[PDB]
Amino acid sequence: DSNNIKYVREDAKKMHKLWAHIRMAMEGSRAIKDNAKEFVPHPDNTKATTPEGVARYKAYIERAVWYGASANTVDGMLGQIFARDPVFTGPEDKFDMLINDVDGSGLSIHQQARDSAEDALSLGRGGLFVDYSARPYIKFIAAEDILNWRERWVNGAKRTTLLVFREESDADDDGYQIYKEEVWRELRLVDGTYWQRTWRENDGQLYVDDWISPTKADGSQFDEIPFVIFGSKNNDPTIDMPPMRDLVELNIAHFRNSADYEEACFICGQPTLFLSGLTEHWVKNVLGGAVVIGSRDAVPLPVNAKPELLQAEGNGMVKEAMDQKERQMVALGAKLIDSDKTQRTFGEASMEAAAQNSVLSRVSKNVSDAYTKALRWAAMFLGLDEKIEYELNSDFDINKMSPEELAAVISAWQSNAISFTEMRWQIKKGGRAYLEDEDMRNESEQDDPL
Amino acid sequence: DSNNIKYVREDAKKMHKLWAHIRMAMEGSRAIKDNAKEFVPHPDNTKATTPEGVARYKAYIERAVWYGASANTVDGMLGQIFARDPVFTGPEDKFDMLINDVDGSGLSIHQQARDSAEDALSLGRGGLFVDYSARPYIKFIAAEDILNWRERWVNGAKRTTLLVFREESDADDDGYQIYKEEVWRELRLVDGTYWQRTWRENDGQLYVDDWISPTKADGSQFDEIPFVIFGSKNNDPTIDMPPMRDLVELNIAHFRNSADYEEACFICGQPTLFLSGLTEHWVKNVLGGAVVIGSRDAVPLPVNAKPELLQAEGNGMVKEAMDQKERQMVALGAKLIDSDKTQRTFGEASMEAAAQNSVLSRVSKNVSDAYTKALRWAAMFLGLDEKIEYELNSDFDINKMSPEELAAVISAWQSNAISFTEMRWQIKKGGRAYLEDEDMRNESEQDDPL
Amino acid sequence: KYVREDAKKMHKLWAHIRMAMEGSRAIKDNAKEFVPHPDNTKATTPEGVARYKAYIERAVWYGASANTVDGMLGQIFARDPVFTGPEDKFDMLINDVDGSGLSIHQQARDSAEDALSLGRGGLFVDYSARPYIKFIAAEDILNWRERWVNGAKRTTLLVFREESDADDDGYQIYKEEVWRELRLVDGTYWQRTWRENDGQLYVDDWISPTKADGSQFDEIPFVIFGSKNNDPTIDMPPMRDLVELNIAHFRNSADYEEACFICGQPTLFLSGLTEHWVKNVLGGAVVIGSRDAVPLPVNAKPELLQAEGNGMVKEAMDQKERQMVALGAKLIDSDKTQRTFGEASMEAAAQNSVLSRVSKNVSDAYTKALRWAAMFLGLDEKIEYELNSDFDINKMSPEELAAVISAWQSNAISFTEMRWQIKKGGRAYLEDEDMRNESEQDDPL
Amino acid sequence: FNDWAYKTMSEVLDQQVELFNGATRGAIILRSAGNTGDLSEAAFWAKIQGLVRPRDPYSNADVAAKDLRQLVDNTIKVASGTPPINIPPSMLRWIQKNPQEAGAVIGQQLAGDTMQDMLNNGLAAGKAAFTAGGAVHDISAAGTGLMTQRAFNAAQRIFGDRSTDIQVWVSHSSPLFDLYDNALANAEQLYVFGTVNVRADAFGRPIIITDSPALVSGAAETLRHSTLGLTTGAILIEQNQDFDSTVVDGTGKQNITRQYQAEWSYNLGVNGYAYDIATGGKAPNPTALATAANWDKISTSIKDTGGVVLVTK
Amino acid sequence: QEAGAVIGQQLAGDTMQDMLNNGLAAGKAAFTAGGAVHDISAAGTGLMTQRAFNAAQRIFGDRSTDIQVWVSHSSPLFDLYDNALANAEQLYVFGTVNVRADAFGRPIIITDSPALVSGAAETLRHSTLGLTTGAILIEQNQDFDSTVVDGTGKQNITRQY
Incomplete structure (x- = not known):
């Protein structure tokens, strides 16, 4: 039945095919080879009808080689984003429960943020949901599970009124555990008040729960839905196109050319x-x-x-085409692969460093804003101090910091230009220290060894 | 009370083929040639039916050459992630028995961490188990042995309700006679309590343990199952796709091309x-x-x-394909092989070092979190301090420190910027010291003998 | 599926590795298993076996694996391994580690080569009175168990073959065998030994060795060190694919030499x-x-x-030589190719991965053996034996001397640490105590 | 991979099967308790008939003799299963993010059909036991066949002074539609438009609708609906938590056959009745369970047994 | 899994029984083929006796002390017990009448191996074999495979070990 709790917006349905292709590219050779029916067109339909033809096609595909550079691009981009650990501003012992296990599963907020950035880089969509059970939990919802949202101009303000996301959990309620029970969360906003339901499909029946308005520590309910959709473009529920579409397409074309080359x-x-x-x-x-x-x-x-x-002989036209595609792939982002034959002198890449890491900077800022908003909503649940921020690494191309760099940062701290916390974070950035600030303070409180 | 103690979740069954392929790629030429039918397609199955056909296939496979760049990659990554030794923060005399023999077999925690990180690099899945016999021990469970798990959302918290793993063992009978007996451990979480059964099957009979809850030194049982699933992506029960898959695919293709080349x-x-x-x-x-x-x-x-x-003649198409596949294996950025003909400008790799050492950083942080959590679980078992850490070697591309680096580090230590212990750890990192910090302090407290 | 590891089927692999290490002779008297006969119809015939003999004799064995191990040992074993603890009390362990006057460093070198070549070995600390730190070959260990008791991975049983030759009045060659039998019952160590006289196994009753103070033993005095880790399970030899490349190159060279x-x-x-x-x-x-x-x-x-040249056979031979160098195994040097200084600094960590792994494994094994020896003699337990963890060591530069002394004037490096730095850099040979004794006097001027 | 989503649109179930535990005020229990064998019998003390006797103080004369007996309850184990399902290769074989032992829609339908079969077998066994115990009323000759609430008052009459124990009715949809139609045209006007929509039976007993085939018999004129009222815990269903499922690939033919089969079991028990395993079988069929003459009456009084069945056309 | 546990518990002992029985049968066959056989059955009463052990030891010449163990059936041991109990030769005293190491300190390992009975009814011929170290060598190949395949189509799911 349509118009249900499980109805999916049209544009999400259109985007599902591209998301599936991106996920298959991320998986690697197995997914592409198994689902090569649409990736690599049959050389002819005449044999494609016959079983001899499909056997030949099986031999054709199985011999092929999947380069798998798009997945490496993502892994490399994520590694560029995530070096050391993201910094946290504000009380720490008063937010320690969120740092140790962001969703009660022992998963630190660093790893959930890493996965969120991975999904915002690969297919470019995600969501963070802050709920109360005493402790607030920050969920992570994949873009495949986001299925509905609604926008209105409420007194001229963009207000997300409706949003339904799919929620999954293994069924353990006695019986025989046939399949895992499946949940849908209907998030609604009326007259500046946050309401929600929980729709459970158990044994084929869609249970529903009474409407509940989650309330803060002080009360007053909510004016916004504690759910932020972060993407590659901006933190809005409108679907933002995935960064990895072009590379996936070039990789697929390279794969089919590789199939032809291997047959030859x-x-x-x-x-x-x-x-x-x-x-x-x-x-x-x-x-x-x-x-x-x-x-x-x-x-x-x-x-x-x-x-x-x-x-x-070598230097054929098929190999020439696939080399051209390899160049095109590295031309559209070099995070996928490197070339020791290519010699690049230092001091020139500083001009293009800004234009290149554009996707990195956009994703880092989007995820930082989304997690800051989620932590602020968690604080509202707990009644904590709102003036907090959780910003990721915006300083890409990282390496061990040179002695001159250390001398410069120390000289900057000796003058009243970089505070002690900032200097220590800068030193930890270059891998010259590991101890936290307070421990170093307490250790240097003592007199000199001598 | 319980269902079949062995039951493989279909995801693990699907991943078994890829795990076996990657394991056999790690094995070398022996495993690949022993199972060549799965990798090297038969040139003519019509021959394969005939006995002279199988003789031809045997002769055509035994002449092949296995590069095994994947084994070299794993070795290189493992050496880079475990140059020097992981550092332990917290009480050391109290935890010394967990460091020296982490499972009671004289295996230091560093070696077990190395093996677990190796499995994380290769298969992207592992597990640490902490149990109580008396003293607690930290187990190591391979990817294949973890045969089922379970996730439930109770009070909005992602909780691991069930996690059963097949712990391989051996029977030391009266004689010297090879028996291979297995032990299955089921870990359950009911009403927020951790429960444990062992299917001992000692003597090949029913020694299934009952509902037993291991209890802390102070008491109160447990709130969470003491078992962590560390992977290349994050510390999730869900499967993390192996970082070695595409390299293994490339090596298999290079192996079949090598077989063709050797025949020619x-x-x-x-x-x-x-x-x-x-x-x-x-x-x-x-x-x-x-x-x-x-x-x-x-x-x-x-x-x-x-x-x-x-x-x-030389420079045939087969060499061209083999060369492009080797260059692709190198392009992926993996440290499988080197080339003295090629040259790289120093200072250029300083920008891409963050992207190249991505998987290394991810596995470092994942295994560090896993071992920190396991050590915390053991501490709770024995009621020690909880704020302890196990920080693996995060810095890569390690090299002997320069005189300029030594001077800068000493200057930083004399200023109230970098702690004495931090400086000593840095000096040990660059191979300029071997004695312990307290040992050097004790020896150097006295004035110069002159 | 497939069996665990290789189902402990590294016997043929170890044999092949040992034959490759032996040199050209061992490979040439094993051409049947390595180099397939070009024709089976000839292979049956006598002119065929003469043809195969002529085919194999003209071949050239490259022998890169022995050079690989030699280079790895040279990188690992520079200066001498460092020993921590009472050196005066353990001198009678270091000088004659097993009663033969062979220093512990040479036995450590032998065990390091065994770890690097086929990835297995064994240290056995027995009590005669004087503790003896034995070295047991990989093939000698012929049984080991993993019964875990009290919820802990434990090695309960281990039997290894022990070799000796008899000096009877007549110089007649008498090869007699001893089988040491290590067992662990209720977490307690028991042993028995066998004496064999041309097939006369004389068994001894089970015995319970004890430490100097008493309390007997809690774990077996035996460690199995490998390239991977110090575990009873079989670890893969580090040179498996390397031998495969060498053998393939050898057969290609046989074809090339016939041509x-x-x-x-x-x-x-x-x-x-x-x-x-x-x-x-x-x-x-x-x-x-x-x-x-x-x-x-x-x-x-x-x-x-x-x-003419540039044929496919020599093309493949050059490819396989490149593959060996590409693997990164320090086996040969190339005068033709050059590498800029600093580019290899980044990959120095990866290249020396097996070196570091073997160094740490053997260091831990020898440390444990020394702990057991100290237990037997009732000496101190805080003793360590760490190999050289800094490979590619060379003569240290004058600016590096300036840095080292400038660092020692500050209280950031110990005097013994500074002396070890200078010694490892090839700038001093006298012991630190001796230098202190000589320099404590007034200046000559 | 085209839809790239689980097709939950599948009509996994149609009959309403929310009839367990608190859904029926505890009339039908669905505890998860594992027990061995094909029977689970328990014995309580029998009620002595002539416990209180007239006595003649002037002359006692002969002395009679009374003995105490022991009655036996029964709980027959019922085993169900799934026919071999050959899963089609289809084209939707992308990596399924959430693992399912059967995958696709097999278990999505299997859970609902398992609950439906449990409920149908329980209802059929209840009807059979009540018919064998005499707790049956057949209002079919009079009028249309179903009255507004006078039909329920007849079951109250049958059950007697302990009628307060009966507190729920399980009925097919057609009897309740007939009741709705009767309410709309109130001959004895007691329904106003506000209260024309009533679910209970004017006695505080809610009525629950289910379309179980076990409550409908015959066709055309012989079509009969069975409305049965239960006491507290009248029908007990015990899941044996012994579910086993397999996926096997058959080889040898032109194409591979990937089959699926599941297996489970459960117990049935009706308050105040025993299953005559001697008359029936070790593993009863749904026909055997629904058949009478296999359900002996154990309780001495019909008031002790839980349930009465009302037959209306 | 209880069924599989039963399978394994019986299977360990049964595998060892098969290995030992095959080894003993092959050893007896090889020794008979090599001519190293002595038959006391035809000479007087056919029964175990110390003289029988000596006569069998007459083979191997001077280097006969290398024979270590006399593996045999239980019935020959009990025949030896019967002979020793009624010591027609004043050798055994009651305290030393039960010894399992009769042949000059060589023990007598006892097992009911059908490979050693080698007879039936009254024409049975019990066979004992004395061994040196390493006489019978049994080498497993470390290739153990266990497979549980399921089948569907029947009233119940079937398994097959």
């Missing part, structure tokens, strides 16, 4: 004799249906007989 | 005379079925007879 | 020749020197034929 290498890659000007009589007399080709074994041939070894 | 070189590699414009009359006149080809002896041929010494 | 022997010599190939012309002027003898010229009939084309 399999068939025509072996040198072959091709004895010309031979008759059946001579072959049956002296050759006898078998030719010894060793160094010490010689073979005679009749008059005007020309033996010529044949195999397809 | 063995058959057509040797030069062959290919005498043409010949007749049997002349052959029996002069040659007599034996041609001398030394420099001291010459052989004539009749009119219009053209000898053409033929051999397979 | 060079047969078709490497150019020949005249006097095409268009009539036997009448031969018997007329050639007379069954062609003089080819520059002093004489040979005449030929009408429309005859002499042409020198010799197999």
Whole structure:
């Protein structure tokens, strides 16, 4: 039944195909090979109908090679984002329960943030949900589970009124645990008040719960839904296109060219004799249906007989095309692969460092804003201090910091230009220290060893 | 009370094929050639039906060459992540028995951490188990042994309700006689209490333990199951896709191309005379079925007879495919192999070092969190301090520290910026010290003997 | 699926690795298993076996694996391993580790080569009175168990083969065997030994060794060190694929050498020749020197034929030599290629991964053995034996000397640490105590 | 991978099966308790008939003799299962994020159908036991066949002074539609438009609708609906928590056959009745359970047994 | 899993029984093929006796002390017990009448191996074999495979070990 708790917006349904292709590209060779029916078109439909043709297609695909550079691009981009740990501003012991286990599963907020950035880089959509059970939990919802949202101009303000996201959990309520029970959360906003329901499909029946308005420590309910949708473009529920679409497409084209190249290498890659000007009589007399080709074994041939070894030579057009695609892939982002043959002198990349890490900066800022909002809502649940921030690493291209860098930062701290916390964070940025600020303070409180 | 103690969640069953493939790639040429049917497609299955066909396939596989760049990659990454030793923060004399023999078999925690991180690099899945016998022990459970798990949302908290793992063991019977007995451990979380059963099957009979709750030194049982699933992505019960899959695919393709290349070189590699414009009359006149080809002896041929010494030329398409596949394996950025012909500008890799050492940083943080949590669980078992850490070697591309680096570090230590212990850890990192901090302080407290 | 590891089937792999290490002779008397016969029909025949002998004898064994292990040992073993604790009390352990006068450093080197080559070994600390730190080969260990008791991974049983030769009045070669039998009952160590006299196994009753104070033992005095980790389970040898590459290169070189022997010599190939012309002027003898010229009939084309270079066989041989260097195994040096300083600094960590792993494993194994020896003698327990964890060591630079002393004047490095720095850098040889004794006096001036 | 989503639109179930535990004021219990064998019998003390006797103080004469007996309850184990399902390769074989032993819709339908089969077997067994115990009323000759509430008052009459124990009715949809139609045209006007929509039976007993085939018999004129009223804990269903499912691939034919089969069991018990395992079988069929003459009456009084069945056309 | 536990518990002992029985049968066959056999059955009463052990020890010549263990059936041991109990030769006293190491300190390992009975009814021929160290060598190949395959189509799911 449509118009249900499980109805999905149209544009999400349109985007599901692209998201599936991106996920398959992230998975690797197995997904692409199993689902190669649409990626690699059959060379001809005539045999594609026949079972001999589908056997040939199976041999064609199974021989192919999946480069898998798009997944490496993501992994590399995520590694660029995440070095050391994101900083946290505000009380720490008063937010320690969130740091140790953000959703009661022992998962630190760092790892959930890493996964959120991974999904905002690969398919470019995610969501953070802050709920109360005493402790507030910050959920993570994949873009595949976001299925409904609604926008209104309430007194001229963009207000997210409705939002339904799919919630999943293994069913353990006695019985036999046939399948896992499945949940939907209907988040509604009326007259500046946050309402919610919980729809459970158990045994084929859609249970519903009474409307409840989660309330803060002081009360007053809410004016906004504690759910932020972060993407590659901006933190709005409107769908933002995935960063990895082009690379996935180039990778797929490279994969099909690789399939063609491997077929050519399999068939025509072996040198072959091709004895010309031979008759059946001579072959049956002296050759006898078998030719010894060793160094010490010689073979005679009749008059005007020309033996010529044949195999397809290199620098072919298929290889040329796939090399062009490899260049195009590295041209659109070099996080996927590197080339030791390519020599780049230092001091030139500082001009293009800004334009290149554009996706990194956008994703980092989006995730930082989303997590700051989520932590502020969690504080509202707890009645804590709102003036807090959780910003990720915006300083990409990281490495161990040179002695001159350390001298400069120390000189900056000796003058009243960089505070002690900022200097310590800068030193930890370059991998020259690991101890936290308070421990170092307490250790340096003592007199000099001497 | 319980269902079958062995039951593989279908995801683990799906991942078993890929895990076996990656494990056998780590194995080397032996495993690949023992199971070549799954990787190397038969050149002609019509032959494969025949017995001479299987003889041909055996001869065509035994000549192949296994590169194994994947094993070298794993080794390189493991060496980079465990250069020097992981540091432990907290009481050390109290925790010394967990450091020296972490499972009671004299295996130091550093070696077990190395093995777990190796499995994280290869298969992207692992597990640490902390139990109480008396003293607590930290187990290591491979990816294949964790055969089921469960996630439930109770009070809005992602909780691991069930987690059963097959713990391999051995029977030391009266004699010296090989028995292989298995122990299955089921971990349950009911009404917020941790419960544990062992299916001992000692003597091959029912020794299934009952509902038992291991209890802390102070008491109060447990709030969470003391078992952590660490992976390449994050510390989730859900499967984390292996970081080695695409390299293994590339090595398998390179292996089949190498088999084809070896067949071509063995058959057509040797030069062959290919005498043409010949007749049997002349052959029996002069040659007599034996041609001398030394420099001291010459052989004539009749009119219009053209000898053409033929051999397979170089730079064939097979070498081209093999070379591009090796270059692709290197492009992925993996430290599988090196090339002295190539040159890289120093200071250029300083920008991409963050992206290249991504998987290393992710596995470092994941395993560090896993071991920190396991050590906290053991501390709660024995009621020690809770704020303890186990911080793996985060800094990569390690090298002997420069005199400039030494001077800068000493200058920083003399200023109230970097702690003495931090400076000592840095000096040990660069291979400029070996004694312990307290040992050096005790020795150097005295004035200079002069 | 597939069996755990290789189902402890590293026996043939260890044999192959040992034969590869032995050199060209061991490979050449094993060509049947390594180099397949080109033709089975010949292989049955006697001219076929003569052909195979000629085929294999002309081959050239490259022998890169032995150089790989030699380089790895040289990198690991520079100066001497460091010993921590009472050196005066443990001198009678270090000098004669097993009663033969062989220093502990040389046995450590042997165990390091065993770890690097086939990834297995064993240290056994027994009590004769004087503790003896034995070294047991990989093939000698022939049983081990993993019964876990009290919820803890424990090694309960372990039996290893122990080798000796008898000096009977007559210099007749007598090979007799001893089987030490280590067992662990109720967390307690028991042993029995066997003496064999040309097939006379004399068994001894189970015995309970005790420490100097007493309390007997809690764990077996035996550690199995491997390239991977110090675990009873079999660890993969580090040079498995390396041997495969060497063997493939060897067979390709056999083919190449056959080609060079047969078709490497150019020949005249006097095409268009009539036997009448031969018997007329050639007379069954062609003089080819520059002093004489040979005449030929009408429309005859002499042409020198010799197999040229850049063939596929040498292409594959160069590919496999490149593969060995590409693997990164310090096996050969290349005068042709050059690498900028600082580029290899980044990958120095990865290249020395197996080096660091083996160094740490052997250091931990020897540390544990020394703990057991101290337990037997009732000495201190805080003793360590750490190998050289800093590979590629060279003569340290004068600016590095300035840095080292400047660091020692500040209280950031100990005097012994500074002396170890200088010694490892090849700038001093006398012991720190001796230098202190000499320098405590007044200046010469 | 085209839809790339679980097709929950599948009609996993249609009959309302929310009839367990508190959904029926505890009339039908669905505890999860595992027990062995094919029977689970428990014995309580029998009620002595002539416990109190007239006595003659002037002359006692002969002395009679009374003995105490022991009655036996029964709980027959019922085993169900799933026919071999050959899962089609289809095209929706992308990696399923959440693992399901059967995958696709097999378990999504299996949970609902398991609950439906449990409820149908329980209702059929209840009807059979009540018919074998005499707690049956057949109002079919009179009028249309179902009255507004006089039909329920007849069951109250049958059960007697302990009628307060009966507190819920399980009925097919057609009897309740008939009751609605009767209410709309109130002959004896007691329904106003505000209170024309009533679920209970004017005695505080809620009526629960279910379309179970166990409550409908015959067709055309012989079509009969069975409305049964239960006391507290009248029908007990005990899940044996022994579920086993398998996925097997068959080879040898032109194409592979990937089959699925599941297996489970549960117990049934009716308050105040025993299953005559001697008359029936070790593993009763749904026909055997619904068949009478296999359900002996154990309790001495019909008031002790839980449940009465009302038959209306 | 209780069924599989029963399978394993019986299977361990049964595998060892099969290995030992095959080893003993092969050893007896090889020794008979090599001519190293002595038969006391035809000479007088056919029963175990110390003289029988000596006569069997007459093989191997001077290097006969290398024979270590006399593996045999239980019935020959009990025949030896019967002979020793009624010591017609004043060798055994009651305190030393039960010894399992009769042959000059060589013990007598006892097992009911059907490979050693080698007979039936009254024409049975019990066979005992004395061994040196390493005489019978049994080498497992460390290739143990256990497979549980399920089948569907029947009234119940079936398994197969």
